[PDB]
């Protein structure tokens, strides 16, 4: 049971990777390259009004 199960990651690297994934989510070629059906999406990034 004392195998090393958990990996400690720097919080700066976690925040870097989260920002990189957020930036990649605004690129529509990468959305299609990840297998998403976004051909009918009017705009990327898709923003919906908070009243809905």
């Amino acid at each position: 049971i004392w195998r090393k199960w958990h990996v400690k990651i720097n919080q700066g690297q976690k925040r870097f990777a989260t920002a990189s994934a957020l930036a990649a989510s605004a690129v529509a070629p990468l959305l299609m390259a990840r297998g998403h059906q976004v051909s009918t999406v009017p705009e990327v990034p898709l923003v919906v009004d908070s009243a809905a």
Binding site: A24, A26, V27, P29, L30, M32, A33, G35, P42, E43
Partner: protein
């Protein structure tokens, strides 16, 4: 900025959802990929200017990327359906691919794909019957 077609190619050159890798070659399922080959020349979703041809009920249907609407996928494609003579379709596709500098390197591939689709839309011929050969197959 931080995003370019070169960057998208460096990101998705090893793996993407369109990739079909086998022993005898690597193919692409991309709709904007002429000849369905995994390369920077033919990666339509990577390239800013890109062309793609799909079959229609009669004729071809050609989609092209609009550079001013890259972030608007619903209005990112300029679509023309060619339902006319094959020569007129080839002329219009070649003009669309070469006259204004919109991927003149894809002109031959686009004309070839249009010709292949229009030839596949023709009726097939009946095959000659299989002839039994030898002794065990014949008897």
């Amino acid at each position: 900025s931080n995003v370019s077609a070169d960057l998208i190619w460096e990101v998705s050159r090893n793996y993407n959802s369109f990739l079909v890798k086998q022993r005898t070659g690597t193919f692409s399922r991309d709709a904007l990929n002429l000849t369905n080959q995994h390369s920077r020349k033919h990666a339509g979703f990577v390239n800013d200017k890109a062309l793609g041809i799909v079959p229609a009920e009669k004729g071809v249907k050609v989609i092209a990327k609009k550079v001013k609407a890259a972030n608007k996928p619903a209005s990112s494609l300029y679509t023309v359906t060619y339902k006319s003579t094959a020569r007129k379709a080839y002329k219009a596709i070649a003009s669309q691919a070469a006259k204004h500098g919109y991927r003149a390197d894809l002109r031959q591939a686009a004309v070839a794909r249009a010709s292949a689709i229009l030839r596949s839309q023709r009726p097939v011929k009946p095959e000659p019957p299989k002839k039994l050969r030898g002794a065990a197959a014949r008897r």
